[PDB]
Design a protein around this ligand. Structure first.
Ligand SMILES: C/C1=C/C(=O)O[C@@H]2C[C@@H](CC[C@H](C)/C=C\C=C\CC1)O[C@@](O)([C@@H]1CSC(=O)N1)C2
Ligand SMILES: Nc1ncnc2c1ncn2[C@@H]1O[C@H](COP(=O)(O)OP(=O)(O)O)[C@@H](O)[C@H]1O
Ligand SMILES: [Mg+2]
Lengths: 360, 25
């Protein structure tokens, strides 16, 4: 029948069916369990509503699944509650973060077949699905989500693992950063509940500056960059340089006390780590994906930082599709919908015969 | 034997008209 596509995000799970232009369900990648009197599980929004009597967990904190009991809860919810289907009836395409350990990929496969009894299954790299979504098989993706951000160079459809760059900094950290400066200005943002207020402020008012210093000076000598936000308690916090200082972190991690390279540098390094005979293709196809790549000005800023690092001859092109927030999912949707892809679904017959290592 | 599958798959991805994709919602 129809294939299922589940993008297991570190912050949000995007789920739906292959052939759709968008994910039917997108919910918080969280699982809550009864806290006292030692049902007995809640996923997504529900888990959040009832935080008061549950202990929440993040099974995919930084892109990698670290808790299998919890993950079984996400997938159960996805299937039966969100999509409302019997997993045994549909082949399932699952996405995984770049550099996911083999044993991890094998346990995901073990669960799908033994726990959810799916007829067929497949595991693809998120970044690669995003490139696919843009109509390319070669290119270099910059995927910045909630818990982690990756640089993934891809040639003829295959990711180049040795050149993959990882930055443990994404949207979640951008929110924690803005939350910090805001609490310092006097507005109390502490609880996770409250943090959701800041996150929303982030998404609606933050942007990337083409030149941090020029922008910084404008904010200091004018009020033309000021925007206002009404808090749920009625207060009207207004912000200026924190509007672009927050995202600036992606380019300068030191704002968060990290000595790691910024996203423009990690992209350059990832390129330079690749066969010199394909660097032009990468440079010409830098595709951005993920919710943290939605900031206004991020594309222009990348184009500037990269042209400055690469050789003057080089043609630098940054691709940032409007559906950026769902490129991965859409990549899987397109893939798992193809005709020629059907010979790719690891089947239970194959799994029952060779084992979990059949996935590689 | 299977590279032809991948090969053809790569072709199907490069020529895929993103529409023809059921409008979710
Ligand atoms: C519309 C929305 C989008 C989103 O990205 O949610 C994800 C998931 C969410 C789960 C925890 C919260 C309390 C419970 C329910 C949230 C529901 C909807 C929030 O934790 C994030 O907020 C974190 C915190 S601060 C940040 O930058 N990411 C990202
Ligand atoms: N319009 C926006 N501007 C800035 N950030 C956004 C926007 N929309 C979503 N985000 C952020 O993107 C992050 C997670 O994106 P996503 O790639 O979907 O998650 P995974 O990382 O896949 O769960 C969050 O930190 C969220 O706040
Ligand atoms: Mg993701």
């Amino acid at each position: 029948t129809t294939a299922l596509v589940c993008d297991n995000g570190s912050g949000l799970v995007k789920a739906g069916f292959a052939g759709d232009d968008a994910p039917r369900a997108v919910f918080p990648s969280i699982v809550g369990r009864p806290r006292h009197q030692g049902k007995d599980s809640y996923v997504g929004d529900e888990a959040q509503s009832k935080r008061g009597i549950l202990t929440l967990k993040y099974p995919i904190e930084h892109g990698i699944i670290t808790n299998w009991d919890d993950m079984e809860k996400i997938w159960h919810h996805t299937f039966y509650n969100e999509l409302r289907v019997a997993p045994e009836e549909h082949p399932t395409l699952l996405t995984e973060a770049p550099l996911n350990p083999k044993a991890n990929r094998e346990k995901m496969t073990q669960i799908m077949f033994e726990t959810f009894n799916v007829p067929a299954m497949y595991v693809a790299i998120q970044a690669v699905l995003s490139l696919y979504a843009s109509g390319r098989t070669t290119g270099i993706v910059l995927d910045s989500g909630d818990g982690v951000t990756h640089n993934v160079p891809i040639y003829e459809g295959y990711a180049l693992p040795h050149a993959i760059m990882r930055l443990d900094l994404a949207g979640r950290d951008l929110t924690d950063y803005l939350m910090k400066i805001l609490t310092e200005r006097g507005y109390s943002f502490v609880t996770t509940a409250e943090r959701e207020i800041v996150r929303d402020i982030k998404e609606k008012l933050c942007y990337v500056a083409l030149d941090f210093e020029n922008e910084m000076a404008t904010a200091a000598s004018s009020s033309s960059l000021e925007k206002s936000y009404e808090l749920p308690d009625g207060q009207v916090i207004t912000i200026g340089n924190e509007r672009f200082r927050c995202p600036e972190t992606l380019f300068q991690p030191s704002f968060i006390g990290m000595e790691s390279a910024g996203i423009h540098e990690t992209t350059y390094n990832s390129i330079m780590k690749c066969d010199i005979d394909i660097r032009k293709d990468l440079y010409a196809n830098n595709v951005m994906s993920g919710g943290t790549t939605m900031y206004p000005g991020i594309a222009d800023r990348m184009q500037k930082e990269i042209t400055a690092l690469a050789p003057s001859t080089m043609k630098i092109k940054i691709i940032a599709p409007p559906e950026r927030k769902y490129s991965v999912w859409i990549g899987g949707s397109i893939l798992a919908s193809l005709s020629t892809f059907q010979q790719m679904w690891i089947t239970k017959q194959e799994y029952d015969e060779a084992g979990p290592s059949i996935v590689h | 034997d299977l590279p032809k599958v991948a090969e053809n798959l790569k072709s199907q991805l490069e020529g895929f008209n993103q529409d023809k994709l059921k409008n979710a919602s």
